[PDB]
Amino acid sequence: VNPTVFFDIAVDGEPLGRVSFELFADKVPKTAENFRALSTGEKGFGYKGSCFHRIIPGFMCQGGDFTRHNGTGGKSIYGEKFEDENFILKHTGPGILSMANAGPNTNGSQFFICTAKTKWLDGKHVVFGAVKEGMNIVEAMERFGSRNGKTSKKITIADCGQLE
C-alpha cells in the first residue's frame, strides 16, 4: 500500500499546520521510499528541521535541502543522487509532489509541492506523490514566498514522519 507522510510546518518557529502526502510507491517505489525514509529520519538524516528555501506563489513550494539549506545540497538514501525512476505521473495540478533536480538523473532529497498545474515539467521532474490533507497549509505557505522564491519568514519542517 502507498505510505503516508506528514510535515508539521512552522513559520519563524511557530506552528502553522500539518501537511500529509500519499506516496505513490505502487508506481515509483524507489523514489517514494527515499522520501519516506527521509521523513522518518531512520537513516540518521532527513527532513526534520529543514526549511522551504524557495517559495514562489502560484507555482510551487520547494524544500528538502537538509545539508546546505539553500538548494545546493541534500542527498538521497541511495547515494548523493539517483536516477529518474520513470515519468509515469504528470504535474496535473496543485498538490503534486515532485523531485527537484539539476538535470537528468540528479534526484537527491530536494522536492517541491506544486500550487498549480505545471505541465512543462512533465518528463523532466519525477512525480511521486500528492498532498492528501493540508493543502490549505501549503497555500498559506505561499504568503511567505516571492516571485524569485526568496522567503520573508523562516518556513521549516518542525517535525515529520510516517502516518498510518
Name the site residues for Mg ion (rule: CB under 5 A): 31, 84-85, 107, 126
> What minimum distance in Å lies between the beta carbon of 107 and Mg ion?
5
Between 8 and 84, whose beta carbon lies closer to Mg ion? 84
Closest residue by Cα to residue 112 from 163, 33, 53: 53
> What minimum distance in Å lies between the beta carbon of 85 and Mg ion?
3
Between 92 and 151, whose beta carbon lies closer to Mg ion? 92
Between 29 and 57, whose beta carbon lies closer to Mg ion? 29
C-alpha to C-alpha distances, 144 to 7, 59, 114, 151, nearest whole angstrom = 17, 13, 15, 6
Distance CA 137, CA 135 (A): 5
Nearest-5° angle of CA 131, CA 26, CA 24? 15
Catalytic residue numbers read 54, 59, 62, 101, 112, 121, 125
> What minimum distance in Å lies between the beta carbon of 114 and Mg ion?
16
| Cα 1 to the center of its chain, rounded Å | 20
